[PDB]
UniProtKB/Swiss-Prot annotation, chain A:
The gene coding this protein: PSMA4
Subcellular localization: Cytoplasm; Nucleus
Organism for this UniProt entry: Homo sapiens
Keyword Transcription regulation: no
CDD domains: proteasome_alpha_type_4 (cd03752)
Name of the protein in question: Proteasome subunit alpha type-4
UniProtKB/Swiss-Prot annotation, chain B:
NCBIfam families xref list: PRK03996.1
Subcellular location as annotated: Cytoplasm; Nucleus
Description of how the protein assembles with itself and partners: The 26S proteasome consists of a 20S proteasome core and two 19S regulatory subunits. The 20S proteasome core is a barrel-shaped complex made of 28 subunits that are arranged in four stacked rings. The two outer rings are each formed by seven alpha subunits, and the two inner rings are formed by seven beta subunits. The proteolytic activity is exerted by three beta-subunits PSMB5, PSMB6 and PSMB7. Interacts with ALKBH4.
Cellular component GO terms, alphabetical: cilium; cytoplasm; cytosol; extracellular exosome; mitochondrion; myofibril; nuclear matrix; nucleoplasm
Family designation: Belongs to the peptidase T1A family.
Principal cellular location given in the protein's record: cytoplasm
Protein name in UniProt: Proteasome subunit alpha type-6
Swiss-Prot record, chain C:
Places the protein is found: Cytoplasm; Nucleus
Function: Component of the 20S core proteasome complex involved in the proteolytic degradation of most intracellular proteins. This complex plays numerous essential roles within the cell by associating with different regulatory particles. Associated with two 19S regulatory particles, forms the 26S proteasome and thus participates in the ATP-dependent degradation of ubiquitinated proteins.
The protein's name in its UniProt record: Proteasome subunit alpha type-3
Induction, per UniProt: Down-regulated by antioxidants BO-653 and probucol. Up-regulated by bacterial lipopolysaccharides (LPS) and TNF.
GO biological-process terms attached to the record: proteasome-mediated ubiquitin-dependent protein catabolic process
Residues the record lists as Phosphoserine modifications: S238
Main location class: cytoplasm
Signal peptide: none
SMART domains (UniProt xref): Proteasome_A_N (SM00948)
Swiss-Prot record, chain D:
Function: Component of the 26S proteasome, a multiprotein complex involved in the ATP-dependent degradation of ubiquitinated proteins. This complex plays a key role in the maintenance of protein homeostasis by removing misfolded or damaged proteins, which could impair cellular functions, and by removing proteins whose functions are no longer required. Therefore, the proteasome participates in numerous cellular processes, including cell cycle progression, apoptosis, or DNA damage repair. In the complex, PSMD11 is required for proteasome assembly.
Homology family: Belongs to the proteasome subunit S9 family.
GO terms for cellular component: cytosol; extracellular region; ficolin-1-rich granule lumen; membrane; nucleoplasm; nucleus; proteasome accessory complex; proteasome complex
UniProt entry tagged with the keyword Cytoplasm: yes
Post-translational modification: Phosphorylated by AMPK.
Name of the protein this chain belongs to: 26S proteasome non-ATPase regulatory subunit 11
GO biological process: proteasome assembly; proteasome-mediated ubiquitin-dependent protein catabolic process; stem cell differentiation; ubiquitin-dependent protein catabolic process
Record lineage: Eukaryota, Metazoa, Chordata, Craniata, Vertebrata
Keywords, in A-Z order: Acetylation, Cytoplasm, Isopeptide bond, Nucleus, Phosphoprotein, Proteasome, Ubl conjugation
Subcellular location: Nucleus; Cytoplasm, Cytosol
GO MF entry, a single one: structural molecule activity
Amino acid sequence: SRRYDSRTTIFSPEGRLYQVEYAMEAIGHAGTCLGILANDGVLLAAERRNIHKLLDEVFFSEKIYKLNEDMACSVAGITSDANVLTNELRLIAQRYLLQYQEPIPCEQLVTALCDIKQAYTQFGGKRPFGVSLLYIGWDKHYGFQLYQSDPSGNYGGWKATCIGNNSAAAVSMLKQDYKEGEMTLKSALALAIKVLNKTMDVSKLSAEKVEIATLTRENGKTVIRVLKQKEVEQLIKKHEEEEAKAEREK
Amino acid sequence: SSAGFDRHITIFSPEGRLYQVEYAFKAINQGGLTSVAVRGKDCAVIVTQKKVPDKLLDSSTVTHLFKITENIGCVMTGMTADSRSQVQRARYEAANWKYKYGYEIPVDMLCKRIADISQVYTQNAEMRPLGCCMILIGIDEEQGPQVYKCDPAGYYCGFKATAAGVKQTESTSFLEKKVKKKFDWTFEQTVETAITCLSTVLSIDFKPSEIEVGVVTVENPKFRILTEAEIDAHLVALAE
Amino acid sequence: TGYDLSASTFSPDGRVFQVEYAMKAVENSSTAIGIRCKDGVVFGVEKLVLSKLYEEGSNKRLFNVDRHVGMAVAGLLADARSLADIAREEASNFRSNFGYNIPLKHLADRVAMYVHAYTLYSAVRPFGCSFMLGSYSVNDGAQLYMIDPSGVSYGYWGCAIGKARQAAKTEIEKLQMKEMTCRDIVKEVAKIIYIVHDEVKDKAFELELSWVGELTNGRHEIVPKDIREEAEKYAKESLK
Amino acid sequence: VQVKEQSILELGSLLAKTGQAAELGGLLKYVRPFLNSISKAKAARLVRSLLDLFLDMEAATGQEVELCLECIEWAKSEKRTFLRQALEARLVSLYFDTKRYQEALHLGSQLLRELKK
Amino acid sequence: ERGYSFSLTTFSPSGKLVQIEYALAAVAGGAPSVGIKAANGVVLATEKKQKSILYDERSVHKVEPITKHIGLVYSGMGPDYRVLVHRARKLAQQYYLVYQEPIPTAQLVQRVASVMQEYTQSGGVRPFGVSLLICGWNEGRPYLFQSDPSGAYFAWKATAMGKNYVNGKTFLEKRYNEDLELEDAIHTAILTLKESFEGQMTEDNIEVGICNEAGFRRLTPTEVKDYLAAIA
């Protein structure tokens, strides 16, 4: 019995533990997602992968999931574990609401899920979860918020982040061009369009190959909208014409 | 073709196969015996050989035929202990069905339940998948005779002429050649064909003390084992 | 290699290797024979004296299972005692549940199933004892059964286990045991054990004889001392 | 019910063997209301098994054009693309044997675009 | 007794799960199958072949009804199919007991996929070796779905699986559209199954299932013979 074991919990002579490292190498491929916020409303942009000619296009959502009245999250990596994790945190939020009769703050929910995710890396002898995902939300404590998770277990707040295969270039371009406390929910969309244009190899940015979700605040609604395909095309062509004009200036 | 522990337990090899199950199929042939089953118009026959190499051994307790139920009969091949255990499980399952549902169990449901039980062994990596085969015969209302076969991999099916053992291939070929002619089938014809199949596959010209025959028919659905005298009667009637 | 470390790995040719190793562990035991008469059975064991320090009657290899059932073992003593205990508990349980002495055809089967349960999984090892069960009843005659560690049990007219099993059965077959009453069988059992195990192999040994049949009204017990004395006195005449 | 269709087929075969066409046309007219009462597969196979036997004999001036047109109409009503396309091919082949100028040209050009896709 | 309690599926140095790939390779060697939907219902077609005339072709079935309006076909290993069928039946039963309504198709697909995924992370087990196609008709719009040993699933208009699935998909690309009827769908399904079929196709080597807003059922051999004729 000890001959067939794989020992998926022990350390290594060099200090690190291999399984979480291999999972992070696995999350490298398979998708591209990013999130940005600077004022009322926060936006998530995702790169659709299944773009074959024969898809029925149901469920009104591809990679964006709703977790509460004011919580949404994307995901990258193996999709089945994504289904598991989303279902797992949904009832966490609901049981908090049942006990306290108050919407759950984002930070506590993220910490709870991260604790569950880390439990598998210390004891049990099971394969870890190969999924990393973002969180966007709003609450009365700190307004609007964005956070990022990790198969290792840790997390952290952010202002603009990317997770997909070309995350390095996206992060460099983001830190090169951003302003603190001025970007309204009109310039952030253009910034995301330009970043996606740079990262993906396919030019002309076919509107069916991207997905955009935005969160905005109302008197008592906190409406989440998934803007349709009838509004992406003019945004893209506006980006194209302004880029052509700027290049022609030089 | 192999990488890791695929040769020692039941996990997929790189090509998509698994060997710990197809080893049991050749473990079947260790006994060195063959059994044949034939289905007729209104009857079903099971025939097998028996070998007693020593006089000290008591020849009355070497039968491979077993009475699973007053209406359902079976024959086994392969390792003896595993076959006995499967017989025990089948008896218990039939009795439980009778207790629970209040009417007799169909043969196909019994075969399916046995196969489903056997399929688990090739799913988990701590058990060994029981290298013994299974043949059942029975009578069903509005259907007549039924002959079913079950294997260690969990694959059950319903046949019209079956052979299990060392000489499976050529016996099936001979049975196919005989059945393609599409002639009428009665009791005597079915028994004669079943006996002659084994006789010509092994080329023995044996005696009435080296085979066993079981029969079921729609006149007394009780499973019965032929006595040596009437076996000799069929044997001499076969030789004009 | 490595196919012969667990009890859950079929070798490429399709057979289990640990059970064969248990067999080879059995073949080094001393010897034990048992033959049935017109109205009972007779067991016989030759027991080697390792050194003069030990006392007569030590570590008897002729166990008494139930009030009318006897056992003779060969192999590793510890496993044999465990099997004797489990059979004894099972027989008592049967008597309590139903209400009469258990027949052999059921007790032997249950013990065989329990032994066979230890040859599938990798968490336990196969047993290493081969044994014989004997009995006599007024309504069923004499019964003799033999069980091996692989989990197989057959009925016999006479059998032998140990090192020189085949040599013993050679002179066993010469006898016409089908006829005589087992009052004169004791002399021939003594004769047949004194004609094996040359004095070159070992210096001294001793004889252990059991008895059951209608002569004892169903009870099973050791032979009286004077009868064994006369039996060995007769058997010494093979020096001619 | 099915025995009626079997007998219809056998009678059609016998009439074809005899060597006349008026009765065959009458048979084709006879069952058109009946057909909307059975399975689609049987209806299609009977339509084909009657049309082929009617056409592969010899010329009758009155009856070798309107039958194909009404079969086209029925296939269009039933919404079966392959059936109507095969019958269009048969009809455009049939126009030529009557020495027709244009109706055997525009039909083929119209069918080319559909077949090429 | 006890099991092993350690996963047999682990991550490779290149960030890939090997066992799932081997299970997919085993799936790729199964019997071919095709599935189509066009504006009125769904058609599932599969090919069956007995080794010799001795086998009884009417004793077992490939297409199996979960309930009155859900159908399911498979490609891959044989014995593993029945376990999934039985589990799906159970799940539909609990759903109907709780809600007093027939289960929607999407919920059943999600639950079955969850089971199949959970079966690749626990200890001392190996993943299933089949790929499934599920069809249904609820609230007018027909639905078609395909599962995966890894647990993922997709929604399709037309799909081919089994041997030479790439050729089937390419063939369906140049033929299928969004406006046909069940009869033409059957015709094109048989046509595309004829690409890799045997020499002679008989009315018993093929199993066909149809779902419309009247319910799921399995075609009897008579009308299968009728459809095979007058085509090809």
